[PDB]
Design an enzyme around this catalytic site. Sequence first.
Site, PDB file in Angstrom:
ATOM      1  N   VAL A   1       0.825  -1.202   0.000  1.00 17.92           N
ATOM      2  CA  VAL A   1       0.000   0.000   0.000  1.00 17.92           C
ATOM      3  C   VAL A   1       0.862   1.256   0.000  1.00 17.92           C
ATOM      4  O   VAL A   1       0.467   2.287  -0.557  1.00 17.92           O
ATOM      5  CB  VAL A   1      -0.958  -0.031   1.203  1.00 17.92           C
ATOM      6  N   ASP A   2       2.043   1.200   0.614  1.00 16.11           N
ATOM      7  CA  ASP A   2       2.862   2.398   0.775  1.00 16.11           C
ATOM      8  C   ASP A   2       3.589   2.804  -0.497  1.00 16.11           C
ATOM      9  O   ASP A   2       4.147   3.905  -0.545  1.00 16.11           O
ATOM     10  CB  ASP A   2       3.883   2.187   1.890  1.00 16.11           C
ATOM     11  N   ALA A   3       3.604   1.957  -1.519  1.00 17.94           N
ATOM     12  CA  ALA A   3       4.498   2.168  -2.648  1.00 17.94           C
ATOM     13  C   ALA A   3       4.344   3.555  -3.258  1.00 17.94           C
ATOM     14  O   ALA A   3       5.260   4.381  -3.170  1.00 17.94           O
ATOM     15  CB  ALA A   3       4.246   1.108  -3.716  1.00 17.94           C
TER      16      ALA A   3
ATOM     17  N   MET B   1       4.650   6.708  -0.949  1.00 17.53           N
ATOM     18  CA  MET B   1       6.022   7.005  -0.566  1.00 17.53           C
ATOM     19  C   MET B   1       6.843   7.482  -1.756  1.00 17.53           C
ATOM     20  O   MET B   1       7.717   8.341  -1.595  1.00 17.53           O
ATOM     21  CB  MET B   1       6.661   5.774   0.066  1.00 17.53           C
TER      22      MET B   1
END
Lengths: 77, 57
Positions: free
Chosen positions: A58-60, A63
């Site tokens: 989810v953070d890809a 970020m």
Amino acid sequence: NLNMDLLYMAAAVMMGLAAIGAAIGIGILGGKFLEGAARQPDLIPLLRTQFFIVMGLVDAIPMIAVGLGLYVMFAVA
Amino acid sequence: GNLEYKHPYLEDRDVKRVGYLVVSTDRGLAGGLNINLFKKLLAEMKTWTDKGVQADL
């Protein structure tokens, strides 16, 4: 010159939007983890395992956006 | 199981009166079958009525 006046806004947006995205995404994803835990405790280690496995994906983009926003706000500006 | 509920039928309370469901034969010539049962029932119903709790049959 005029560059100082737009970049500190462009980065601002570029990172506030990623903030919204990651925040809501992780809130939703963790809600189901908590409901599952309260439903069937002692599966918590397994839920936490595969939660962290998923959460990493989810953070890809949020970020990436944060990184490029900073790369602009300082290294470009 | 991993969860539990507060349904009345599952946890005790103060015994103020008791109910009995009594099974008996419809026909005689069975010997003492019915009377042993009724005597046991009467003994325990007497116990409970000594503690001052009624009973229903």
